[PDB]
Design a binder for these strands. Structure first.
Lengths: 77, 58
RNA sequence: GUUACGGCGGUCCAUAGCGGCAGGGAAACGCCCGGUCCCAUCCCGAACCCGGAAGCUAAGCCUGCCAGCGCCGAUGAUACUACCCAUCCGGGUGGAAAAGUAGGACACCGCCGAACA
RNA sequence: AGUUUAACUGGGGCGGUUGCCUCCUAAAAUGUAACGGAGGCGCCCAAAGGUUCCCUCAACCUGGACGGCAAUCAGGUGUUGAGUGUAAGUGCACAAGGGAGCUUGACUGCGAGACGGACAUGUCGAGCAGGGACGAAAGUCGGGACUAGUGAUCCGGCACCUCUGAGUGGAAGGGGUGUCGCUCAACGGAUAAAAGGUACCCCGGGGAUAACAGGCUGAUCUUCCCCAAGAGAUCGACGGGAUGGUUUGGCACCUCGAUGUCGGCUCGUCGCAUCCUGGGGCUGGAGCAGGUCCCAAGGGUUGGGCUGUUCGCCCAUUAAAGC
RNA sequence: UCAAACUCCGUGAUAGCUGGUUCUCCCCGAAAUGCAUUUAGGUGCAGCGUCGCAUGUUUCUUGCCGGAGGUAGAGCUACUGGAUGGCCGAUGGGCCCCACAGGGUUACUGACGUCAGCCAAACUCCGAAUGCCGGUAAGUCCAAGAGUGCGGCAGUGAGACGGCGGGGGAUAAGCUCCGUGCGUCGAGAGGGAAACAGCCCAGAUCGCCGGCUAAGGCCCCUAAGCGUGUGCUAAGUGGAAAAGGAUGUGCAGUCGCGAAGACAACUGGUCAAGUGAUUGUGCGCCGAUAAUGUAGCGGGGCUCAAGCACACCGCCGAAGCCGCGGCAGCCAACGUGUUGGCUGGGUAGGGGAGCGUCC
RNA sequence: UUUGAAGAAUGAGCCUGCGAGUCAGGGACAUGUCGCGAGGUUAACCCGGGUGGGGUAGCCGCAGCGAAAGCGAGUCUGAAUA
């Protein structure tokens, strides 16, 4: 039979969920398209990877119909 | 309110959550009893293991 | 503070949209006049830009009213399901849809600025 | 003469496959097998890269010389159904889709923090410095919407270095930095270099593992039955529901520190789905004789030609020459 | 003795292979998975054990809170595909005219659509439950003998069956391959299922001629009920099976006809109360059917139930729990070894402490 | 030996003897214990009828970074205190 070929699993998906505190540079989601769009303090990578630009807590929101990921600057002690 | 919970069935063949709920309640053998206050956490615990224990209202 | 006013923003971005009917030009917003200057057309001053204000609210715009199209949308019940009983059939505790219906809806909020006090 | 001649395989052989990417299987985090189901890759682009600015399709309707469903032109409707170099998927109309101007960031030294992971690999990354591109500026630029377009180590080649230089000065050679050379495609790559036969075979293991027999199931076989389209009591198509392990099958639980493989002879035993004999029923039974269907397992059920045969065909019989 | 004799030597050749490996007790206690592999019955690393050290509840359970899904379900003029009740309707060909230009008629072929109804692992405008990530409050806490890191020593890397969700095969297998804070066996004795690794109850430290129970049972075998009350079954159903067939019977619901005389019997007469078809149901019947011997209740036997359904009351029943006594490991308290609380099945394997033999 | 064997998978007629993790090396790692301790220790060899005494050659600690030249509580990369 022709079949029998497949590629490796790419382990995509969301890495940090709502409420998790993160450091700057931490990867938030691993996605192919822009399923989630960058929000505040969130950048987009070459492979459309979302990461944190500032420390804080992950917050999932919708902006003009697009699901977005933002970082909330948790209060200093 | 005060609840008396007695273990009536064996842990053998039970799932991990049920054994751990029985331990969290604080009983180890058949026919052992504990007295625990009637709160939501206690209700969740007895709801996990209702098929292994008998509950009586003190 | 007020006006059928002009902008700049919002909201898990239509409950806001589209359509229909009826209105207006105070300052503004426009349409409008022209290509002399900056600038422009893969050709075209159509657009972009510049210089003006003779004309006009017919349009844009915004005001009021329409559920018409779209849109939003319960409760209940059911499907499904975690756990547990049950020799199958099925049952108990908990969670609980989509669809449909009742209904909502012809947007709401913030900051400036015009004209008026 | 010394050796090599891969693995997977529902036992083997032919065949196909071996690395990377996309979807389903996959049970709403990730991951998840099959010789399971679908496809693609071993590139390409000097612009299809960077930046700044601008634009919005496809489809339909109407009208236009050739011109037509369909070329180019105009008006309207048109929120994504077009297109994105290339599979598929996730995206993208705010455009990542279409156009133009300048340009080379398809940089150098780095890199907080992470993802993924047996390890080796792999992946993202703000920000800092140098020197630039585009832009009024803010700013963006460490190739391309993203995910494939690839090969470790060893060994050797080339360029540069303020490294080393076997007594000394050199040089040779070595070293560092950048980089080149592998369908090592069996793609974690046993050698730089390798095909076959054995029924002349030998050894050690394995029922992981098969061959004959069983244990299970039933594609197939057979014994029936269900409705009745019909032909005309008897046959019953088209469909449907059951037994059996008497057929070939499927599985490999059983044995490879041995379970003889077909027929025949000798000797059995059992079932009844009855060939004869026994008892009935209806006859499309006049009688004879049959058809056909029930009950019935006591006994009986031939000898030869051909073939190793079972099977089969034939020759004579017989109450009958059963399965 | 011959597809390369024999003897000695290299030599104690080499075998990822087969077999074997010898005293005791105490504590803990697996795996049959992932990746790579001239690899698949081997091995390396990881996963899971044990010992030591360090760290402390960071592990786990339950409640609440913050999150992302695209499964089940559902839906579809919300897309893409297959479709339909497939309707007209394209498109082509024949037929009729005969021109062959032009044409029309279908048993013609008959596009897409769509009033409406469908379907989908590779469809999704929707969309759970569980599970997963984080936060938080408690629980357990003289214990889980929990997590994490480092080091010493490992074994394992052929799993099996049962329950749920799927693929391959003919949804056939006591077939095969995956998922499952699923279970058990492996490595688990005891009780039950007649016997019965994988099913049900329950985890064995030792002793007792004590008690209470679980699953399963209580006519006799065989411990405990030929138990009580209300009903059903005639088939030994119970104590195996389908399509289908069938005036069995209990209950309930309907309707038709009927004292103007109902049904049967003998449209009109005699006669004399029910007489007809169903509807769902609880048990029953044929279907039912192979070859050693009853053989499809474990046996005897059972309907005078010892069968079934529903209520009720007892008892039997294990190494489970309790009672009394002995021992051991860990920890705690106070002490200068007592007491107390938990724990003590176990293969591979890890650690600790000992018996016996000889010099 | 196995997923699993009371056996229809393996081996054993019986008894008594015999029969399988040992040794070497200043080897390597870990962990006990003893001596000395910023030091510890000798090898060959020599002298003692011994198991005792001597023997400093070496070895391991005592500074690291860098390919190396080299610098040094720093060092390498780098134009850079970047």
């Amino acid at each position: 039979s022709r079949n029998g070929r497949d590629s490796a699993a790419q382990r995509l998906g969301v890495k940090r969920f709502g409420g998790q505190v993160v450091k700057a540079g931490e990867i938030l989601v691993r996605q192919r398209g822009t399923h989630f769009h960058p929000g505040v303090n969130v950048g987009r990578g070459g492979d459309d990877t979302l990461f944190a630009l500032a420390p804080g807590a992950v917050e999932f929101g919708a902006k003009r119909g697009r699901k977005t990921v933002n970082i909330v600057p948790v209060a200093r002690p | 309110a005060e609840l008396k919970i007695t273990q009536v069935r064996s842990t053998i063949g039970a799932r991990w959550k049920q054994r751990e709920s029985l331990r969290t309640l604080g009983l180890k053998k058949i026919r052992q009893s504990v007295v625990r206050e009637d709160n939501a956490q206690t209700r969740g615990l007895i709801n996990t293991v209702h098929h292994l224990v008998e509950v009586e209202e003190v």
